[PDB]
Amino acid sequence: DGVGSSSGNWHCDSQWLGDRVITTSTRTWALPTYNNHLYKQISNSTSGGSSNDNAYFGYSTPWGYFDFNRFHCHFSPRDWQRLINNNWGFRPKRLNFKLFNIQVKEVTDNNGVKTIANNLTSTVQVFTDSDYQLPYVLGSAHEGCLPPFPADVFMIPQYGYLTLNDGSQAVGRSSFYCLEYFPSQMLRTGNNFQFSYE
Amino acid sequence: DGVGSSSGNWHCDSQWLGDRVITTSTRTWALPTYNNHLYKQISNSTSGGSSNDNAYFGYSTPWGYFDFNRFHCHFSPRDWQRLINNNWGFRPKRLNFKLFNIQVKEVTDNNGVKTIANNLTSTVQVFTDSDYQLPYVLGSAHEGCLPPFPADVFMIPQYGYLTLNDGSQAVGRSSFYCLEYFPSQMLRTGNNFQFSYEFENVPFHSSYAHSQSLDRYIPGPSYRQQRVSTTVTQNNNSEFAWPGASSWALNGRNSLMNPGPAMASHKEGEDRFFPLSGSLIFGKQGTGRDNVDADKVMITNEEEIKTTNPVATESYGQVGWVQNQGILPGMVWQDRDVYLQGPIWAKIPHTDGNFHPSPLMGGFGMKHPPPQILIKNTPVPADPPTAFNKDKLNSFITQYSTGQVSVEIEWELQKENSKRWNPEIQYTSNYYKSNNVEFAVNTEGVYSEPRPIGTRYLTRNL
Amino acid sequence: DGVGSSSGNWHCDSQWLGDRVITTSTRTWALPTYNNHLYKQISNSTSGGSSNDNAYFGYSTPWGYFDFNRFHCHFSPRDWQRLINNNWGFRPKRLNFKLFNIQVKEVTDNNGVKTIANNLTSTVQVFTDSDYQLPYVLGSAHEGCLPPFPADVFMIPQYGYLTLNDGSQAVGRSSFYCLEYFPSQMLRTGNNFQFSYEFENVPFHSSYAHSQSLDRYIPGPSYRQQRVSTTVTQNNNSEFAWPGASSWALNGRNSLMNPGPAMASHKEGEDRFFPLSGSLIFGKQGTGRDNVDADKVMITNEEEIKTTNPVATESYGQVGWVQNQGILPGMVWQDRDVYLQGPIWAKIPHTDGNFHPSPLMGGFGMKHPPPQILIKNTPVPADPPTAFNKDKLNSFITQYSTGQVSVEIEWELQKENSKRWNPEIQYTSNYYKSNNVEFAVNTEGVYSEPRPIGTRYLTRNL
Amino acid sequence: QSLDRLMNPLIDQYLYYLSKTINGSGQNQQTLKFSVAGPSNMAVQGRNYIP
Amino acid sequence: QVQLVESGAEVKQPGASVKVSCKASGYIFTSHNIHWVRKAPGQGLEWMGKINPSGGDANYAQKFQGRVVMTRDTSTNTVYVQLRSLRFEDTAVYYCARVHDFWSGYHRALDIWGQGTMVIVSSAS
Amino acid sequence: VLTQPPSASGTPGQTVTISCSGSSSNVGSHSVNWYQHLPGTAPKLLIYSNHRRPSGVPDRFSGSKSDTSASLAISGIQSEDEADYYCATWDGRLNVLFGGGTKLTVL
């Protein structure tokens, strides 16, 4: 729409209708620029033998990802207390994700003092793998979740993934997934992004 | 549309549909200010080479230009596998090119610092030569391709062109094009630029290696090449690097034969010999510019055509030997093989006549190949002095402009129909372990390609 | 429309349709702040009454004015060849103007470093005089014209005018215009501007030389110029430039007749001799502004018109010699030629009479020529005090503006019918090898026109 | 206004004039020195109309 | 091999500013940050802050937030700290070290240090 | 920087030539103006925009400008008329320039 008019509104609420529930949550996120925009190979060889079972190989891309995978990102401790006491069972049905009010910054340092300044035009890329083509890393219970408390501005974790290896050395049946290779919407300070899933 | 609303979106995908393919690719780009906003003139002297062979004349212009001419730009080493294994040949149909999200930064230089700030109002000029009026540089296999690995951010190459010359001096026929005299589009930070193209119908590229040798008609034309051995004790201890090479000559200037009409690299079973100037020798990643030694350059080989085309280190026969042979009637031959790093098209020069125009380095020769795309920053003049001076302004604001670039080509395929009973050769990775994954980024962060890839794998009856 | 959106599109083109031509050349301009936003009287003080002819009284203004009034703006040296070889006569039809991408830069100071920052909300006044109420200064072939080479940013010349004077003092019949006092359109950083003009009906130019001579109706007027020789030795050993001068007194101030009624510059077979002031003169590239040597300037010889016109160095006839002849029943004559570098039009002054209004320097006469275009910045005052002070604000921010300017002029042609069995005299390049293609930038990047180009080549009957 | 003065006082004409036919007193001193015509000396400038 | 080279020493009297140079030879030089550790006699190591090579923007330290200024240059491949107001108190051997991650995203340490630099600050000529 | 010779010799009752050699970007485009400087006092404007002179300037000065050089003619040199004489021109967008300067010698 434009630079000056907001791209969304702040919804954090929970609305209990009969046998179903709608729990919405909205937080602030700062995403730094990881790996200087450079995909790189990671492995621990700290010794020629390294560690028997702790050896690993993989890459570490610049993309960050969103982990809401934890219960306390969606529930206020009351709404949980309301949930466990009065109910035998529950289950998710649909998820709605809206990402708005992008604000880009430019860190310039002059004469010993570094001063942040809005870079209006610069853009932010985002996409949702809906074919589950990338490695799925949300399943390992990693930190980096949305924060439990709405007033907490949080920072976005880095996405990197692992692959087949023998020792610290890969093998041809490893594969290197470029994330640049997927189509991804670009966003400036005016745009938002939204999608739903069943 | 406007400042805050993104103009166009990142598209990078491959869509495999039936008999036809679509490979879209995107990249990010920065455009400096070349030649300080000045058309200039260049000779060998300004460069300093005094030879007659290397004499040239011509101009070098501010305008930048995009080059996607190389396969590795559109195809990802996955596809170029899936592309070759499964198919008896291909050719392009439609190329679509876009350019969006312009941004303009005005570098400021202080006593010890230079701070970058946006100049929103500043503009960028772009146009495409669809009438093929300008000289066409994309046919020389120049550097400056879109990078192969999408997260890279590539610098746009300058645009300059050679014209006719006698020594370093021109002749009255030598002509000078001023690009500003071409209508172009002006893009502020909100505008985008996109067009489409249609590849004129060409023969499919032939991807296959004849199972059955011709002598089991006649083989095709031949022009010999001095045989150089990667065993450097075998090679004669003499400076035959320049004197030895065959060289087609024009206007009194000897030009090396690079590579020359397609011929086999070496006799079957001898893999360590190669034509001195016959085969393309790609630089490995990390290779310097000059005086490199052997292992820093990959060397292609034409072995798959050793059935039809005669060996480039051998004589075509006897009549006394015959070192060169032109076309006889009833000949057959196959063209040179396109590689993952190699070019895609070149432009058939405009003549009254030519024979079998498909270029030598490989690819699809065309009389209306895809237009060039030239680009520059419309210069913002620095503050003039309060009283007129007839001169042209010599002081400008130092800028560069960055953005995105994306290109979508539609390749068409030809299926493999063979009734052969036993299995084929297929191109594949080597399972055996290594400190790095081939065709992928190392710990340092620099993307490397270990090996060339030919397109000839499946076989056809001759 | 917005800051982010480009307000126009670069057009430079030449389109050749039948009997008509189209020429659009878009160039880049830069406008400073003249006189710190003060209309100021100027006057010529000079000596104590030694030089009386050089007196002038007039006003200087902030407004800069776009002067495209010279040909080489609109035609490219290729087209001028195309245009002159094939077409007996031509003349413009439709003028059109589009002024866009106005940017108002705000040069400032930052504790020792100059800073050219953006001012978005500052404005740019512009307006056309379609009613010709103002003095018309495009008439004297002044400097500040659009650059011949497209890629050179130019700078807008200042505007100022003169009026009646007795000596350096003004007179009660004088007129002080104020340009603010016109309705003017304020273009802020996003807007653009345009207007359209229909050239009043003018006689075709004549590009041709008579294949026949009038001796073989009496030749035209003559007013004799002293005859100068390009070889210095032949010339008289005295300083006779002022004394030699052919002058016409108006109001007791002797003004040198320049260039003078159209006549042949020299007799056939005497190329070196040239009229003192009859011929138009140009500078070469970067030629000094005072007292430069002969080969530093270009001297255009009118010879093409000699047949019908009396020579400019010879007396008219006998009765005693006739030095100056006016008009007699049965005279015919040819116009003064036009040049690639020479003006297009002039304004026929407002009078109860005129004769053959065609302006002397060449080109076309008009009563209502294509209007003037005046563009000044809008003053932005520095922070005024708290305690109201009736004096006007004398302290302003420093600004300047930059942008595009485009002009589209529809030209008409008069086709070649000739039956001449032997081939014409065509303009052409010379083939002989040289260090710089003519009309092309050199190593430095300066663009230089080596030779003036006159439009008379073809031949018609007398 | 007035016919000979219609010009703009602030700008040079690209046209020229012959300013000097001599360097200075002596034998064989003739020379041709061209100069630009502009606001300082206006009576040598090229004009389009005559009384 | 990965190497970091401070320049030679200078002697500058209080109130003078002295920049120091660090040449990063043998690596990409934009992917790794460069930290300036200082040691004044009889005092522990002290961190003057880091510059982000490619970024050009620096993060200074609480104590040195005012006086220290950091600048770099990719072309000459070197980075500069400029200590504008030298004092007797600010007499130290200056080091430039780089963060080195040992080929793992998780770990951060200063693996390569320069040979050294010593600033002798005293008004006495 | 423009070049003009360091010294000018003289004798009472002569004229002295003083010359300043510019370039196509310096004196070529714009005029030269000549200053008297009499060390200890403010520079003084003798010749500006070639031949024309300021109301105070004695008649005895005449400057003249060639294509690339500027010449200063001082009529009636006098003992008191000696001073360091400078060349000045407008080059670049608008910056003023000065020739090295030359000290007359009256004897």
Short mmCIF file of C-alpha atoms in Angstrom, two decimals, chain A:
data_model
loop_
_atom_site.label_atom_id
_atom_site.label_comp_id
_atom_site.label_asym_id
_atom_site.label_seq_id
_atom_site.Cartn_x
_atom_site.Cartn_y
_atom_site.Cartn_z
CA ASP A 1 0.00 0.00 0.00
CA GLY A 2 2.61 2.54 1.13
CA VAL A 3 5.42 3.46 3.51
CA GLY A 4 3.49 5.51 6.01
CA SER A 5 0.33 3.48 6.44
CA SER A 6 0.69 0.39 8.59
CA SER A 7 0.63 -3.05 6.99
CA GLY A 8 -1.26 -4.82 9.80
CA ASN A 9 -2.67 -4.74 13.31
CA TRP A 10 -1.69 -6.32 16.60
CA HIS A 11 -3.84 -9.30 17.56
CA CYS A 12 -3.09 -11.32 20.68
CA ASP A 13 -6.26 -12.87 21.99
CA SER A 14 -7.98 -16.14 22.70
CA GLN A 15 -11.65 -16.68 21.99
CA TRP A 16 -13.41 -19.72 23.42
CA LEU A 17 -16.37 -20.77 21.30
CA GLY A 18 -18.07 -23.97 22.38
CA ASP A 19 -15.93 -27.00 21.64
CA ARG A 20 -13.23 -25.10 19.75
CA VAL A 21 -10.69 -22.36 20.42
CA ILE A 22 -8.86 -19.65 18.50
CA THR A 23 -5.54 -18.63 19.99
CA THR A 24 -3.66 -15.85 18.25
CA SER A 25 -0.26 -14.47 19.14
CA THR A 26 1.85 -11.60 17.88
CA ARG A 27 5.48 -10.84 18.62
CA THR A 28 8.33 -8.67 17.38
CA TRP A 29 11.35 -10.20 15.66
CA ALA A 30 14.74 -8.85 14.73
CA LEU A 31 16.64 -10.75 12.06
CA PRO A 32 20.32 -9.95 11.71
CA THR A 33 22.37 -10.84 8.64
CA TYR A 34 23.95 -14.23 9.20
CA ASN A 35 27.10 -15.62 7.64
CA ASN A 36 27.78 -12.41 5.76
CA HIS A 37 25.43 -13.79 3.10
CA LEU A 38 27.57 -16.92 2.62
CA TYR A 39 26.51 -20.57 2.66
CA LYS A 40 29.28 -22.62 4.25
CA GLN A 41 30.20 -26.19 5.15
CA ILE A 42 30.34 -27.18 8.81
CA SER A 43 31.90 -30.17 10.43
CA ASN A 44 33.67 -30.81 13.68
CA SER A 45 36.99 -32.42 13.21
CA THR A 46 38.80 -31.36 16.37
CA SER A 47 40.96 -34.50 16.20
CA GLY A 48 41.97 -36.82 13.39
CA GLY A 49 39.72 -39.31 15.11
CA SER A 50 37.51 -36.46 16.41
CA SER A 51 34.61 -37.90 18.47
CA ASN A 52 33.13 -41.28 17.64
CA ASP A 53 29.46 -40.37 17.91
CA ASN A 54 29.67 -36.58 18.00
CA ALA A 55 31.06 -36.16 14.50
CA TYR A 56 28.75 -34.50 12.01
CA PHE A 57 28.70 -32.83 8.62
CA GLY A 58 26.34 -30.36 7.04
CA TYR A 59 25.91 -26.78 5.96
CA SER A 60 24.88 -23.54 7.61
CA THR A 61 22.75 -21.24 5.45
CA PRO A 62 22.00 -17.54 6.14
CA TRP A 63 18.22 -17.95 6.17
CA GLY A 64 16.46 -17.69 9.47
CA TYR A 65 13.30 -19.60 10.32
CA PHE A 66 10.28 -19.20 12.56
CA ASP A 67 9.80 -21.64 15.43
CA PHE A 68 6.39 -21.40 17.02
CA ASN A 69 6.43 -25.17 17.60
CA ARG A 70 6.06 -24.80 21.38
CA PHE A 71 2.80 -24.66 23.32
CA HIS A 72 3.63 -21.58 25.30
CA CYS A 73 3.86 -19.42 22.20
CA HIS A 74 0.10 -19.84 21.75
CA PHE A 75 -1.23 -20.01 25.32
CA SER A 76 -1.39 -17.62 28.18
CA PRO A 77 -0.88 -19.57 31.39
CA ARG A 78 -4.50 -18.91 32.26
CA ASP A 79 -5.81 -20.22 28.93
CA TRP A 80 -3.74 -23.28 29.62
CA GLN A 81 -5.17 -23.62 33.11
CA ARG A 82 -8.59 -23.22 31.56
CA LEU A 83 -7.70 -25.87 29.02
CA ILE A 84 -6.37 -28.69 31.16
CA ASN A 85 -8.95 -28.52 33.93
CA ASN A 86 -12.16 -28.68 31.93
CA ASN A 87 -11.24 -30.95 28.99
CA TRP A 88 -10.37 -34.53 28.14
CA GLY A 89 -8.76 -34.04 24.75
CA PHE A 90 -7.94 -31.47 22.12
CA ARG A 91 -6.11 -31.05 18.84
CA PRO A 92 -5.15 -28.35 16.33
CA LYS A 93 -7.29 -27.76 13.28
CA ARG A 94 -6.06 -24.75 11.30
CA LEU A 95 -3.16 -22.29 11.49
CA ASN A 96 -3.06 -18.72 10.21
CA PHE A 97 0.24 -16.89 9.79
CA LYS A 98 0.55 -13.16 9.16
CA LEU A 99 3.86 -11.32 8.97
CA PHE A 100 3.72 -7.57 8.75
CA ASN A 101 5.30 -4.19 9.45
CA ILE A 102 8.72 -5.02 8.08
CA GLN A 103 11.23 -2.37 9.17
CA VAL A 104 14.69 -2.41 7.59
CA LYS A 105 17.70 -0.70 9.14
CA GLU A 106 21.14 0.32 7.95
CA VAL A 107 24.03 0.33 10.39
CA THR A 108 26.48 3.03 9.40
CA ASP A 109 29.32 4.04 11.69
CA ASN A 110 30.96 7.44 11.28
CA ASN A 111 33.64 9.16 13.39
CA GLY A 112 33.56 6.57 16.18
CA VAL A 113 29.80 6.54 16.69
CA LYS A 114 27.63 4.05 14.86
CA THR A 115 24.22 5.33 13.90
CA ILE A 116 21.29 3.20 12.76
CA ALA A 117 19.15 4.64 9.97
CA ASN A 118 16.08 3.46 8.08
CA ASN A 119 16.87 2.06 4.69
CA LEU A 120 13.49 2.37 3.07
CA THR A 121 13.90 0.49 -0.17
CA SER A 122 15.80 -2.61 0.92
CA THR A 123 13.82 -5.82 0.89
CA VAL A 124 13.33 -9.01 2.87
CA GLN A 125 12.80 -12.43 1.31
CA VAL A 126 10.49 -15.05 2.77
CA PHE A 127 8.88 -18.30 1.73
CA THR A 128 7.12 -21.34 3.11
CA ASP A 129 8.25 -24.74 1.95
CA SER A 130 4.88 -26.29 1.33
CA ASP A 131 6.27 -29.36 -0.40
CA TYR A 132 8.56 -30.24 2.54
CA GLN A 133 11.54 -30.23 0.22
CA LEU A 134 14.00 -28.70 2.70
CA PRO A 135 15.25 -30.56 5.78
CA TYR A 136 12.72 -30.25 8.56
CA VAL A 137 14.55 -28.91 11.62
CA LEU A 138 11.62 -27.85 13.77
CA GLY A 139 11.22 -31.35 15.15
CA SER A 140 14.31 -31.44 17.34
CA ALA A 141 13.03 -29.12 20.08
CA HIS A 142 15.52 -26.35 19.42
CA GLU A 143 15.53 -23.04 21.22
CA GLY A 144 14.69 -19.88 19.31
CA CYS A 145 10.95 -20.11 19.90
CA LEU A 146 8.59 -17.22 19.85
CA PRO A 147 8.89 -15.79 23.36
CA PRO A 148 6.34 -16.73 26.02
CA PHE A 149 5.62 -13.21 26.96
CA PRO A 150 4.16 -10.90 24.33
CA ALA A 151 6.23 -7.92 25.40
CA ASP A 152 9.49 -9.68 24.57
CA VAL A 153 11.19 -8.62 21.34
CA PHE A 154 13.00 -11.75 20.20
CA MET A 155 15.72 -12.68 17.72
CA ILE A 156 15.38 -15.16 14.86
CA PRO A 157 17.43 -18.38 14.78
CA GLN A 158 19.67 -19.48 11.95
CA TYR A 159 18.80 -22.33 9.62
CA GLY A 160 21.39 -24.96 8.88
CA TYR A 161 21.07 -28.63 8.29
CA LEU A 162 22.98 -31.85 8.39
CA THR A 163 23.61 -34.67 5.96
CA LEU A 164 25.30 -38.02 5.50
CA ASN A 165 28.91 -38.41 6.52
CA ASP A 166 31.59 -40.93 7.39
CA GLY A 167 33.84 -39.43 9.97
CA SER A 168 33.79 -35.71 9.28
CA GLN A 169 33.86 -36.32 5.51
CA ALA A 170 30.74 -36.40 3.37
CA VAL A 171 29.72 -39.07 0.88
CA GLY A 172 28.17 -38.73 -2.53
CA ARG A 173 24.71 -39.53 -1.24
CA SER A 174 24.86 -36.30 0.74
CA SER A 175 23.11 -33.37 -0.88
CA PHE A 176 23.46 -29.60 -0.70
CA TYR A 177 20.15 -27.73 -0.65
CA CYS A 178 20.37 -24.14 -1.75
CA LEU A 179 17.51 -22.21 -0.22
CA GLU A 180 17.91 -19.46 -2.79
CA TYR A 181 16.58 -22.08 -5.19
CA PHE A 182 13.01 -21.85 -4.13
CA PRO A 183 10.63 -19.06 -5.16
CA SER A 184 10.26 -16.60 -2.32
CA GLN A 185 8.27 -13.41 -1.98
CA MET A 186 10.26 -10.23 -1.39
CA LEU A 187 8.96 -7.59 1.02
CA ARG A 188 9.69 -3.93 1.55
CA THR A 189 8.68 -1.71 4.42
CA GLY A 190 5.15 -1.57 3.09
CA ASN A 191 4.29 -5.22 2.39
CA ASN A 192 2.93 -8.01 4.51
CA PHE A 193 2.76 -11.78 4.07
CA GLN A 194 0.09 -14.25 5.07
CA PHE A 195 -0.84 -17.87 4.54
CA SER A 196 -3.05 -20.54 6.07
CA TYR A 197 -2.75 -24.26 6.53
CA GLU A 198 -5.09 -27.23 7.39
#
